[PDB]
Every structure is written in C-alpha cells, then in structure tokens.
Design a protein around this ligand. Structure first.
Ligand SMILES: [Mg+2]
Ligand SMILES: [Zn+2]
Ligand SMILES: [Zn+2]
Lengths: 1336, 79, 49, 49, 49
DNA sequence: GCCTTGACCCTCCCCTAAGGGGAGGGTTTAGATTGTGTGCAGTCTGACGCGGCG
DNA sequence: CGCCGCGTCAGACTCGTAGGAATCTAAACCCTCCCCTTAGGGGAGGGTCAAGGC
C-alpha cells in the first residue's frame, strides 16, 4: 500500500487542496430541525451528506443518483462516511503565526530569523515595529523599533525604509530571507569561530536553514494564512439520549476562530481605528493559538466549566491522546473478562472457561457451524438458536473450541508471561479456572483477581497461540533461564512432607521390592510416609549416546521418596528425590529434567509433581494452630537482661559517662543483640524440637512443626516472619526513618499493646504507601526502556566480530556475589578459552557455552572468559544471533526475528516492583596474594609501602582464581610480602581512614624549598608530644606570599647533593597542599616510606543509571595522561594542568577546590583515573575509558540494585539497553564525508558511511560515541512516529515538520501504529520479502 | 490432539517459520480442497498441519513443489 | 478486532463461512490521527510508492 | 440555589453513600479526607502527608 | 491545613550545598498567601500568591 | 400459453379566496453613565536556554 | 566570552457502578417567506383488471 510516512510544513495551497470548501460561518446545525447549516462548521455541501446516499434537500434520495451534486442544496449524493475524510478551510483575514513553530522551544521562527523570542513576541503582539528592509537608511535589518522610534525615523527618513508589526511583519521577514546565502555566510562564520557556545549556536542555525533548503518547506509557511478545518465527524455534535447535545471542544475553538476572523474582516471593511484592528488581530491570533495548542501562550481558554478546552494538540499527545490510547493500545472484540479461580485438575496447556463466556466469545464460529451442519437455514435462525441456547448449540460450542486456544491476560502485563495461551475446557461456573503452576508467571492469587480472555481468530493467530504463546512453551523465564512454571505453596509443602524422614516411623527398616510396594504399604496403612526404608530402585542414565541405560540397586530412602520416584521421568537420577524437597530442590529438579530430557517430559513431570504435591499436602492434614508458634522459654529473661543493660546505660547517661548520641546507639545495639538472641533461641526451640525414641533411646530430629515445615520447605514464610510470630517483633522505625529506641518485645502470638501496635503501624503504612506509589515509577521506567529498545531485533546470524567483554566473577570485597558459571552460561565465546596449561584450546572460539561447557570451565580453573556482547556487535540495525547468545526462554541460540529489545526492557522492568522507592584488610580464607597498580617502596621497619591510589589486593586460591578483591588508600603500608601464602583472618593492609599521608620518593635527608618560615607555617606545640609540629594552613590564613606559593619539601644527601631517581633524573621534592600537618625538621634522615605530612579528609537508582544522570557532584577524572601541575589558583576554580610527554601539552580544568584532590604534582596519571573522588559519571567513563568500560559500569551498578533484593536478571538484557543508549556519535573530524564537525549522527550511519568511504579509498569520519539516557535516546531515533508516540509529541512533530522527515516504518511501534505486521517474529519473513521485492 | 509443539519445531528449525508453514498448510486444508496426509483424528486443520509437519510430510519445500506441480499441471491442462 | 472498519465485517463473514483469514486494512484511528495532524499546519502523508 | 446545589451534588466531598451494611454507612459518615476543594490532590501528595 | 502562619524549611534540597533555607507562610481562611523565605545568600524575600 | 387494449384505479403534488399565523431577518432607540476582576496553591526532578556578573 | 542562578517545560497504574452542571440575559417596529385554512379539482406518473387477438 505504502512504504513510508512523510511529514512537512503545509503551504496555503496544500491546505486549500485538502479542503472541499471554505467554512464561512460558525453555525453548526439548525436549532429546530437539526440539519447542518450552510457554510458552517457542519455543512453537507462542504463536508458531505448527513444521510448515506441522500442530499440535504431530499431531492436526490437514492444510489440511482450517486455522485451528482444537487443543484438546490449543493450536497453530493454519496456515502456519509466522507464526513470523516473531507476537510475544510478558513481563509484568515490576517496572517497568524503557528504556535508550534513559535513557542515550542527552541523557536523555529526565532532560530531561523536569529531573533530572540522576546522580540518576535513583541512584534507579534503589535507592541513593536520591526524593519523588514532598511534601504537608504542607517536602520539594520530586523531592528526592533518601539512606536516612538518608528514615528521618529518615519518622518526623519521618509518612506525609504519598511517597518511593520504583527505576524505580517514576521511573515515578510521569513519571506524576504535568502536561505542559501545565509547558509554560506554562517558556514564561513563557523570557519572563523573558536568559541564553542557560538559554534553550537551556529551549527543549530545552519542545520535548521539546511533542513529548510533540502526540504520543500518555505519559511513563510510557519505563518498561517489558511487554516485547515477538521472533518466534522471527528469533532461530532451528537444528540444525547435525553435530547441534549454533546460536542467537542474543537467546535468551540473553531467557532471562536471564525467569529474573530469574520469580525476582523468586518472591521477592515469599516476602516476602524487601528487600535481596534490591532486588538482584533491579537484576538484572532490567540484564538488560533488556543485552537492549535491551548495553554502554551497565556492562559488556557476554558469553556462553560472553567475546565480548559481540549485543543488539536491535546488530541494527539499524552496518555489520553491518539497515540497512547487508541493507536498503541486499543479495546478489542472477541474479548471477555472474569474472576479467576483455581483448577488443580487441569493440565498445563488448558484453562477452564465458562460456557456462558465461551458462547459469547465464539459466537460467529457457532453461527458458521450451525449453518454448516444444517441445523440453521440462515444466520438469523442460528442467532435465535444461540439466544434460546438450544441443546445443540452446546455441542456446536464443544466442537468449535476444541483445538482453539484462547489468550489469558492479567493486568499489569509486566512481562510476556502475562499473556499465555490455553486450550479451553468448558466449565459451568462464571469464573475462569487457572492452572496453579502458571500463577507465578501471572503474579496471580485467587483473592479477587480478574483475567481477560481473547480469542485468536485467524489460523496464523491460532498457530502462534499454540506454538509461541501456549503455556507449555513458557516453562523457562526469558529474564533468566530459570523455570517460571514452578511448584509453590501447597505443592512444595506436600512434596516436602512426603520426602521427609521420621526416626521411628511405622514400618521402619523393611526392604521393599520397589516404589509400587512403598505405595501399597503407605495406602494400606502398614508403613508411614517417613519410614526410612530400603527400596530396590532402578534408575536410567543417558550414556555418551542418547541411549538410556538402567542400573538397579537397593537405596536407603524413605517410603515417601520411593512413592515420589514413580512420577520421575526416566533419565533422571535417584538422588534427585533422595532428600527432603523444598522449593529450591523442586525447581532444580524441573530444570534438570528440562536440560536432560527436554520439554515434553518436563511438562508431564510438572503436572505430575503438582498432582502429587496437592494429594500429599491433603493427606498430611498440615494445619496451623496457636501451639505451633512456640515462644522460647528463655525469651523473658533475655528481655529482662536487655532491660537491665538499658537501665544501667540510662544511669550512666544520668551520671555523665556517655552523651546522648552514644547512649542512644548503645541502647539500639543492646536491643538488636537481644533481638538476635531471642531469634536464635526461638529458631533453636523450633527447628529440631522433635525428640523421638529410637528403640528406647531419645534422639533429636528436624521438627515436624507446621510453622517450621512451611518455612523450611520454602512454601510460605521466612525466618524473619517466624520471628514476629514466636520471637519478638524488634525495633521499629519512626516515619523519619530513625529507630524507636524501645522495641516491640512482643510477638503476634502474644498481643501487642496499643503503643506497640501504633508504632508498628508507622512502618506498615510506609510500606503500603511505597507499594502504592512505586508502581507508577516502575511502569514509567519500563515504558522508557521499551521505547528505547523496541526497534532492536535479532536480524543477522553472525556478524563475524571478534570483540567482546571479558566476563569475570563479581567479587566485591571478600564475597563472590556472582560466579563465572551464571555470568557466562548461554553466551558465545569471543576468543579461544585456554587452560592454565598454556596454548591448549579448552573451548573453541564460537562455542555457545551450554551447561556442559560451563561444567568444563568449572572443573578447570578458568577465571575469565571473553564472550560476545550486543554492545560490540558489528551488525547495523539489529544484532546477530551470536553476539546475543541463548534465548533464555528456549535454551538454544536466539532465532532471527526475535524482538530482544522488548524482552530486555520487560526483563528489567518486571522486578521493579520488588525494589524500594524510598580500617584494615581482613582476608577470609587461605591463598596466594597478588597486587595490581602498585607504587611500592621498602620501609625502614621491614614493610611494603604502596604509595598509590589505583592499587588493589587480590587473593588467589590454589585453583588459580581471584576470590577476594579489596583496594587500599594512598600510602597503605603492607604487613605482608606480596606474592606468597596468607591465612584466614590474617591482616594484610593497615592504613589511616581519616587522614591522608605523604610518602617519600627515595631514601635521604630532609631539605626545604620555598617554605619561607613564618609565612607558610604555623609552628604549634602540642603540649603532650614533646616536639612541636608545623602546619601549612589555608590561603586566607596568611598574608601575600606563601598563601598560594607552595611549600616544597626537598630530599637531598647530607653532603648537599640532591638525590636522583633510579631510571630518571626527575628532581625529588614533595609539594604539599594546604591543611597539612608536618612533624619533620631539616637534617633528620628519612628512608623511602616515612609519612611526612598528614592532610586530613533502589528503583530510583536504576532509573538514574539508565537515564545516565550525572550525579550531584561527580568524581573528577584525568582526561589525558601526564604529570600534574597547577595554573591560576585563587579564583575558586583550581586550575590543573596535565602535561603529556609526547603530546600537545596544555590541558586545563577548573576544579573547584572545595572537594579534596587525590593527586600530587610529582605523580603521573593515566587517562581516566580518579583525580578527585565521588560517584563516577557514566559519560566520563564512556569518553575516557570506552564503551566496554561504561557497559561494565552500568551492568554492575544495576545488578547491584537487583541482586540486593534477590532478583536474578541476565545481563544480556542490560547490555541491550546500554547498546541502545550508545546509538549516537558526534563527529570530531569529517574528512571527505557529508557530516559537519560537532554534529550528532547515528553511530550506524557514520559506520556505514565510513564503510563506503574507505571502500572508495577516501578517508572516513572520526567520531566520539555519545551516551544518552533512555529518554533522550528514544527521543533521538530516526523515526518520528515512534518518538512522537513516546512523549514530547509537540517537539518531535515540530522538528520533523520543519526538517521534512520521512519515516520508513522499520521498528515495532511504527508498524503497530499503522496496523501492520511487526518486523519481528512471524512478521520478520514478511518484512524481508517486502524489502527484497522492493530492492529488486 | 496437540499439547507441546516441540517435535514440529525440530523439523522446521524455527518456531516463527513453523507458524507460517503450518498456517499455509492449514489454510490449504481449510478453504482449499486438500485432504490431510495424516489420519484426521478429530483434529482441527491447525493441529493436522502440525501433525503433518512433525512427520516430515510437510515443510516449505514440499509445499512449494506441490503448488508448482499443481500450477504447471493445471496451466497445461487446457486447450 | 478493534478499528479496521471494513476488515472487521469481512472477518465476521469469514468466520461465519469457516474461513479463518483476515484482510487487514488501516486502523481508523490512524486516519483520525492523520486528519488531526493536518488540522495543525502540518502535511503528514503516506508515501504510497 | 446554584451555589448550594453545586456543593451538595457536585463536590468531591459530597459522595454517594456507601450503603452495603451499617458499618459501611457509619464508616462513610466518620470519614476524613485530605482531598477536596481547598485540600490536597492525590497525585501530588507526597510520602510524608 | 489550618489558617495561620507556618514556619518551614527545605533541608538541603537547594543550592547543592546542604544549606537549610527557611520560610514562613501566612495562609488565611480566604485571601492571598504571604510567603517569606531565605535565599542561599541569607536575604529575605517576600512572595505573594 | 405470449401480446395488446380499453377502461379503470392509486398516490402524490399543486391549486383554489382572502388573508392568518409565525419564523427569521433587518433597523433604531438622543438625560447621563467612560479601566475586568476571578482565582489558587502541601510536585519533585531533571533539563534546557538565558540575562547578568566577572 | 564563560559560568550561575532563574524562568520554563515535560512526565507521573486498569476491572464494577455513578455518572453533568447547576448565575448573569430588550423592545418596537418593519419586511419577506413559508405554511395554513374549504371541499375537493386537475393532472402526472405509475399500476391493475378483465376483454380477448394470435
Ligand atoms: Mg489478588
Ligand atoms: Zn439536494
Ligand atoms: Zn554480532
């Protein structure tokens, strides 16, 4: 049909060619006989007939006369549907500026004219004149005149010059300007400029003028002289049920425009005084502005409610505009809704659908099969049969729903498992019966939740429901490869109770012929489910081939584990059930079944697990009583002891031994300790207090307490909640967040009193208000992520890149937060993985690291694997299937046509409602030590002194992999020789946290340089030290001289010889900053390593990381590598000069010195190391360290937020969003290219342009990749439709109109807007043969 | 009937291509006069198409050679 | 299912005839959108090549 | 008449009586609202109110 | 909110320096609001409505 | 069965005599009067563009 | 010309039933145009009913 959408400015002739007549009157319809009035806003002569195939006068009344325009009424005899398509126009009596091109910032009229919006608005409002042309006059072009200046220069310099006011003046200025001449003038002005602010000004204006030259647009079309009128059926005036009329606000706004325009024409006919005509022109301008965008300029016009009228711009923008309410999502037919209940009998692929719902949802199918089977002669006979609900329409309904899936949806659809397809089973209720195992995917409970049903109509939709969306395809999560159709609550409690063992249970110690004998003995009441017993078990294993070989042996098992073995599929080991099965063990059992045997055994296994767990949770009788909340018998004395401690601390505070701060902190500490004591006593009295007799002798076993069994199986409940049931509730926080110093010593088994309950509600309401207010923030973040990543699709199979990220385990301090195996599983290697035994290929170059390769990496010592990433994919407009890796929902490599961007955005945004809206080194374990980035010297006391700020300590095991990683401050003295064994708890590093020491260069003697005493020093004596110290104070502390001039502590030999560096002849001196305390004099020897001077020192976070927000005061990084020097101080901006050795030397910054610097004048810096400290800005990380550094930073900083709440997301999904944030590139040197310098282009565009330029031997452009947040990256897309539908619709449509953009509909949103197959999924083939039957 | 579609995805190596092949064959059976190549055990044409795909009787190349055979046969069978 | 006015009656008739195929056209709200962007001074247009 | 008619029929604080049971009715009558004309808006009411 | 004069501040949520800026607000039952406030440079500013 | 033929018949629209009734449109109106008149708001946080000081 | 505080702009969950908003306001003239009034008359346009003629 069409292949692109173009947007541009409309000329007056274009606007008159859309129209079918001029709207000349504000009449809508006759009040007596509601036919539309001629020449009005509803006019059948302009806009089309109001009855289908009938004129207005009734003279031509049938399709016999079609297309004939009546000569009496002028109405064309045609369909009335044309009243939705036929526009009109208003010929404006005065030129009126378009408010979008004036007032949507930056102003296009202002930027094109290079006038301030203050001067343009003064001319528009008839307050000032502007000189269109100066002539033989001293007046420059566009010079603004007040009225008196105009009347002076008019009589003084005659009518040689031309000066006007109003939008006729602005229009004459926009018409009189030469765009190409001004482009050349501005370009040669750019070639004369070094000021980067003015250079940005000029490149903005140049690309505006160039967009106007390249487009067909003319500047003067930004001033309206003709006004389009929307078709009247899109602004309908319709009679309501009670005879009242309902209208659009556009009729009010259009009527006001017509009324002020007709009065302006009248006044120009009467030759009114010009104060009246200027007023009418201002009123027509503000009426047209209110029609186009109501509320931008001035106060919003309200009509008859004091509610502002909805303008044309409000129709298409916002959450309730066309795009977001009607185009990006719709209300659909063949859709129902009901409360969901549980069906525990259902199979995983089926739902229960009420017969009353299905009879309506499937109604044309039933009509078709009633007429087809001869049971109805006519669709109306069939309709009456279905109304009467004859007994045969239920048979017809049972055969029309037979293999026909339905989609079930629960809002909010946070991820794609919120829509799943099921085969319906017709039930008799009114409630949908949902399978239990899918509820966790839906986040559904049966406490009043509703779900929507949708009927797939076409064969393709039915086969996508069956093949893509069916719940038996959805057992693995797409966020992480973990099972998402997983047992819970009742199932895991039944499977846990079944697989537990009692000590002296009935039937203990017999020997069973198999699991069938165990079931016989349990059912006949001769053995207990927990009787530990000896069963002959035959288990099958897969050999090297796909063959399944059996082994039979007597296992020491229980009766219930033998019973549970009967439902386990064959390729699985008996050790998978020979344990008590909690939630984790059952999830791992399902994952094991999936990886070993595949999907068909796994869905059968999951159904059998559900049935068995339900059955044996029923058999258990597992109740909850009040005697199950066993309160520890020593809780009262723990509380009495903490009360005695708090009383003695209170008496200490009365006796002045402690101030209120440490007093309060001591009370908080002795109550947190007593709470931990009560919790440990409660859990110890709860977890094993089955004491049981084995042949007379008492023995302890794990407890069959019901509260404990629910908590221990992972069914429901944490230890933190058993603490509130049976322990004490503990310390509560004020709404301030500060802890109330008297805790709830009660639990819920005992009562809380009124005061305890009140201070518990303090935090209960805070949590509930967080839940209520963070869904909006998480939805907004997910929407921004989808709209930044929607266009990313796996388009290629392999891009042949060799880049990638080096995956290592995440180690923060001395904990391994993320192992290598789950950071590298399902990813394609980027280089051959080698053993510690060198040059032997362990894993070849393009291997997808499935579980066997990961076990091979784990049994070897591989600590780092370089893998392929989407940020390093070479594919233009997409991603190859190898840089992505596995589809985590399938378990194999991703397919071409997968919308991995929507999956990534949903995977990140789904857990957002589980996030919150509001010194020395102690090595843990044994292993070798190695340090990195060390500036190391030997102290006089047998030490290692690491005088650096980039060093880090790493603890290696005998395996060879780093297990702990710390990093130590400047001048941290090492208690260890680096490179050999340490022990657990062994202190390796000690330093000063609160003060920064100065550590010397080489051994020698103190010498002084530029420290003129009395002006750079206060020599102060500390009364109990014996030797006085010398302070180098602030700059305002002393007079001119040493305040800015730096004291330099030289080191020389005692014979006066300056000591020279090993390797360089660099002069050994130490320049120290102000606020320093020195304890040294001249003459005393100092070896290398003496410390001479001491200078003393949730969900919003993820949203800030993806928006790439620069923090409040960032870290300061070294742009270029070199040596530090200092320029103009004593302004407030300390001037740092990094001096390279082989580059262009001067590079300065303006560091405000109210942040402590962490660099010295003698030490070098690498590009990007911290000069000052603070939260790093990701733009700086990208510029100075690169793309891999900023993606490493963003994935680590986002997974720190997610791992803290126990949320497991693959970092494929964060790398997808990071790749979509690195989509632009600013050109630094164009070469022989079509780009300017300092111009932001797409990275793929400049990469393709360089591919073509180095294909023709010429030099391509050089660029610097930008980092944009997810809002600025999704607003900077090459598609104006998706950007305008995301947000800021006015800005997007304004820049797209003045630039003359064209949208080729290449992403998912633009094909959703326009009702096409998306270019992903099963529409990927269609778009491929749409583009190869267009490029041919 | 059809519970899991995994066996048909192995033959037609994509889930996205499987839907297209199966919908082409299911439309041949539904509105064309084509009879199933498998015993129709009270299945709908979508499930019959999936059961033919999972038996190797239908793929995109088989559907292509079948339509080319029918097209050349019926364009040749007139004077 | 929602906005294609000619296509939804064709779809109903196709379901009644046992032919589960759609002939999808343009959503009517996209035509409303195009007419509302043109009621601003903006020439938005489908490039029908 | 219009001022008091607008208050009693159209205010945000003039609410359709919750008449499920006796507890609904006396809970509705003993209700305090920060919203309404001269009060807060539920969209810009922060965490601390 | 009751009518009267209320003394409040922002606690370091301005001027990027953690400086607390105080304000006073006279709220009538009916009439214009009268706000005094401190800028980050300790000048007193009146603000009406 | 096909085809005419003369006589009937129907509704629908316009006409009657002397204006009645009403709808919908114009026009002037001569003591003197000379600046509206409401609110409402307990958002925060980014982010961009600009006067104004240095 | 470069930087800092100020003005401004743009974003911020889907089911059932209730469910809106409620003020304010010429008169006396004149004109044309359209429909209306009895008790049916006249005609145009389009159908219908028995006769037969082949
Ligand atoms: Mg619920
Ligand atoms: Zn007509
Ligand atoms: Zn790639």
């Amino acid at each position: 049909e069409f292949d692109a959408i173009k947007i541009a400015l409309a000329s007056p002739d274009m606007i008159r060619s859309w129209s079918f007549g001029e709207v000349k009157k504000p009449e809508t319809i006759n009040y007596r006989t509601f036919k539309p009035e001629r020449d009005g806003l509803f006019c059948a002569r302009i806009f089309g007939p109001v009855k289908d195939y009938e004129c207005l006068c009734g003279k031509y009344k049938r399709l016999k006369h079609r297309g004939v325009i009546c000569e009496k009424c002028g109405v064309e005899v045609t369909q009335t549907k044309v009243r939705r398509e036929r526009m009109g126009h208003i010929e404006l009596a005065s030129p009126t500026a378009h408010i979008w091109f004036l007032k949507s910032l930056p102003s296009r009229i202002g930027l094109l004219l290079d006038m301030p919006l203050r001067d343009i608005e003064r001319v528009l409002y008839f307050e000032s004149y502007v000189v269109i042309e100066g002539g033989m006059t001293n007046l420059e072009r566009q010079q603004i005149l007040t009225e008196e200046q105009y009347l002076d220069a008019l009589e003084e310099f005659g009518d040689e010059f031309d000066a006007k006011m109003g939008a006729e003046a602005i229009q004459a200025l926009l018409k009189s300007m030469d765009l190409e001449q001004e482009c050349e003038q501005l370009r040669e002005e750019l070639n004369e400029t070094n000021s980067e602010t003015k250079r940005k000004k000029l490149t903005k204006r140049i690309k505006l003028l160039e967009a106007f030259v390249q487009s067909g647009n003319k500047p003067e079309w930004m001033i309206l002289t003709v006004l389009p009128v929307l078709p009247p059926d899109l602004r309908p005036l319709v009679p309501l049920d009670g005879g009242r009329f309902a209208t659009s606000d556009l009729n009010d706004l259009y009527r006001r425009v017509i009324n002020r325009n007709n009065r302006l024409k009248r006044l120009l006919d009467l030759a009114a005084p010009d104060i009246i005509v200027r007023n009418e022109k201002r009123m027509l301008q503000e009426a047209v502005d209110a029609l186009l965008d109501n509320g931008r300029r001035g106060r919003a016009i309200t009509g008859s409610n004091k509610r502002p009228l909805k303008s044309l711009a409000d129709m298409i923008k916002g959450k309730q505009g066309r795009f977001r309410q009607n185009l990006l999502g719709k209300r659909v037919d063949y859709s129902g809704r009901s409360v969901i209940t549980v069906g525990p009998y259902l199979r995983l692929h089926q739902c229960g659908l009420p017969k009353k719902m299905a009879l309506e949802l499937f109604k044309p199918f039933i009509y078709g099969k009633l007429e087809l089977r001869g049971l109805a002669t006519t669709i109306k006979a069939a309709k009456k049969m279905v109304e009467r609900e004859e007994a045969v329409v239920w048979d017809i309904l049972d055969e029309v729903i037979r293999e026909h899936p339905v989609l079930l949806n629960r809002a909010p659809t946070l991820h794609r498992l919120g829509i799943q397809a099921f085969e319906p089973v017709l039930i008799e209720g009114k409630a949908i019966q949902l399978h239990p195992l899918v509820c966790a995917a839906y986040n559904a409970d049966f406490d009043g939740d509703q779900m929507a049903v949708h009927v797939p109509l076409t064969l393709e939709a039915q086969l996508e429901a069956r093949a893509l969306m069916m719940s038996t395809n959805n057992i693995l999560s797409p966020a992480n490869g973990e099972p998402i159709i997983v047992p819970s609550q009742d199932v895991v409690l039944g499977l846990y109770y079944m697989t537990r063992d009692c000590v002296n249970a009935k039937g203990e110690g017999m020997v069973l012929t198999g699991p069938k004998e165990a079931e016989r003995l349990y059912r006949s009441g001769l053995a207990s489910l927990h009787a530990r017993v000896k069963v002959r078990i035959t288990e099958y294993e897969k050999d090297a081939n796909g063959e399944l070989v059996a082994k039979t042996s007597l296992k020491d098992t229980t009766v219930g584990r033998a019973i549970l073995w009967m439902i386990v599929p064959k390729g699985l080991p008996y050790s998978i059930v020979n344990q008590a099965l909690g939630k984790k063990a059952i999830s791992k059992m399902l994952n094991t079944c999936y990886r070993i045997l595949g999907l068909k055994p796994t869905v059968i296994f999951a159904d059998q697990i559900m049935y068995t767990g339900f059955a044996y949770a029923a058999r258990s009788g597992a109740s909850v009583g009040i005697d199950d909340m066993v309160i520890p018998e020593k809780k009262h004395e723990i509380i009495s002891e903490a009360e005695a401690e708090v009383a003695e601390i209170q008496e200490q505070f009365q006796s002045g031994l402690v101030t209120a701060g440490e007093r309060y902190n001591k009370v908080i500490d002795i109550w947190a300790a007593a709470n931990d004591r009560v919790s440990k006593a409660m859990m110890d009295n709860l977890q094993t207090e089955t004491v049981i007799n084995r042949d007379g002798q008492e023995e302890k076993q794990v407890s069959f307490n019901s509260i404990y069994m629910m908590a221990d199986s992972g069914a429901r409940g944490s230890a933190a909640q058993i603490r509130q049931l049976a322990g004490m509730r503990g310390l509560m926080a004020k709404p301030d967040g500060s802890i109330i110093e008297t805790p709830i010593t009660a639990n819920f088994r005992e009562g809380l009193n009124v005061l305890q309950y009140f201070i518990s509600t303090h935090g209960a309401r805070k949590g509930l208000a967080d839940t209520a207010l963070k869904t909006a923030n998480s939805g907004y973040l997910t929407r921004r992520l989808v709209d930044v990543a929607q266009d990313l699709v796996v388009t290629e199979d392999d891009c042949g890149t060799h880049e990638g990220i080096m995956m290592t385990p995440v180690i923060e301090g001395g904990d391994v937060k993320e192992p290598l195996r789950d950071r590298v599983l399902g990813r394609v290697t980027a280089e051959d993985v080698l053993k510690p035994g060198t040059a032997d290929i362990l894993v070849p170059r393009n291997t997808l690291l499935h579980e066997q390769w990961c076990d091979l990496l784990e049994e070897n010592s591989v600590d780092a694997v370089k893998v392929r990433s989407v940020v390093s994919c070479d594919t233009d407009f997409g991603v190859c299937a190898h840089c992505y890796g596995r589809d985590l929902a399938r378990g194999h490599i991703i397919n071409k046509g997968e919308a991995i961007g929507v999956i990534a955005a949903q995977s990140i945004g789904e857990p957002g409602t589980q996030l919150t809206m509001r010194s020395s080194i102690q090595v843990k374990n044994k292993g070798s030590i190695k340090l990195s980035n060390v500036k190391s010297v030997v102290n006089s006391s047998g030490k290692l002194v690491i005088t650096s700020r980039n060093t880090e300590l790493k603890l290696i095991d005998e395996f060879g992999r780093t297990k702990e990683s710390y990093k130590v401050p400047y001048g941290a003295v090492l208690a260890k020789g680096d490179g050999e064994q340490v022990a657990g708890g062994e202190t390796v590093a000690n330093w000063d946290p609160h003060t920064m020491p100065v550590i010397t260069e080489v051994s020698g003697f103190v010498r002084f340089t530029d420290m003129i005493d009395g002006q750079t020093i206060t020599r102060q004596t500390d009364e109990l030290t014996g030797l006085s110290s010398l302070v180098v104070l602030d700059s305002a502390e002393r007079t001119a001289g040493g305040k800015d001039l730096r004291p330099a502590l030289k080191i020389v030999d005692a014979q006066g010889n300056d000591v020279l560096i090993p390797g360089t002849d660099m002069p050994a001196q130490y320049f120290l900053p102000g606020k320093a305390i020195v304890q040294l004099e001249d003459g005393v020897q100092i070896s290398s390593g003496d410390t001479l001077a001491r200078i003393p020192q949730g969900l919003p976070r993820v949203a800030d990381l993806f928006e790439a927000r620069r923090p409040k005061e960032p870290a300061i990084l070294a742009e270029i590598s070199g040596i530090v020097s200092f320029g103009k101080e004593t302004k407030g901006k300390r001037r740092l000069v990094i001096t390279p050795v082989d580059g262009s030397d001067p590079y300065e910054e303006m560091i405000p010195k109210w942040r402590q610097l962490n660099v010295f004048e003698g030490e070098r810096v690498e590009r990007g190391d911290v000069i000052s400290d603070g939260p790093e800005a990701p733009h700086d990380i990208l510029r100075l360290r690169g793309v891999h550094a900023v993606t490493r930073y963003i994935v680590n900083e986002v997974q720190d937020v997610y791992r803290l709440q126990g949320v497991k997301i693959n970092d494929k999904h964060i790398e997808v969003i990071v790749r979509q944030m690195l989509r632009k590139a600013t050109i630094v040197n164009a070469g022989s290219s079509d780009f300017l310098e300092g111009e932001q282009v797409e990275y793929s565009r400049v990469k393709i342009a360089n591919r073509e330029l180095e294909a023709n031997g010429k030099v391509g452009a050089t660029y610097s990749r930008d980092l944009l947040g997810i809002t600025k990256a999704s607003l900077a897309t090459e598609s104006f439709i998706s950007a305008a539908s995301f947000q800021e619709t006015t800005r997007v449509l304004t820049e797209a109109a003045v630039a003359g953009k064209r949208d080729e509909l290449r992403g998912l949103k633009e094909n959703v807007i326009v009702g096409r197959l998306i270019p992903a999924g099963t529409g990927y083939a269609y778009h491929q043969d749409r583009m190869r039957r267009r490029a041919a | 009937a059809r519970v899991t579609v995994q066996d048909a995805v192995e033959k037609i190596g994509n889930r996205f291509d499987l839907v297209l092949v199966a919908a082409r064959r299911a439309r041949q059976m539904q509105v064309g006069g084509k009879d199933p190549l498998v015993p129709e055990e009270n299945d709908k044409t979508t499930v019959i198409a999936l059961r033919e795909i999972e038996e190797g009787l239908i793929n995109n190349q088989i559907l292509d050679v079948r339509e080319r055979q029918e097209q050349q046969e019926q364009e040749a069978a007139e004077l | 299912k929602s906005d294609d006015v000619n296509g939804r009656t064709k779809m109903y008739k196709n379901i009644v005839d046992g032919n589960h195929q759609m002939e999808p056209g343009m959503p009517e709200s996209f035509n409303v959108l195009l007419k509302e962007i043109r009621s601003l001074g903006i020439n938005i247009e489908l490039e029908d090549e | 008449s219009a001022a008091v008619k607008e208050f009693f029929g159209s205010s945000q604080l003039s609410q359709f009586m919750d008449q499920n049971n006796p507890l609904s009715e006396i809970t509705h009558k003993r209700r305090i609202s920060a919203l309404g004309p001269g009060g807060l808006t539920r969209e810009r009411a922060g965490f601390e109110v | 909110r009751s009518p009267g004069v209320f003394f409040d501040s922002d606690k370091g949520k301005t001027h990027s320096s953690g400086k607390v800026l105080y304000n006073a607000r006279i709220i009538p039952y009916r009439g214009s609001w009268l706000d005094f406030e401190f800028d980050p440079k300790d000048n007193l500013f009146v603000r009406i409505d």
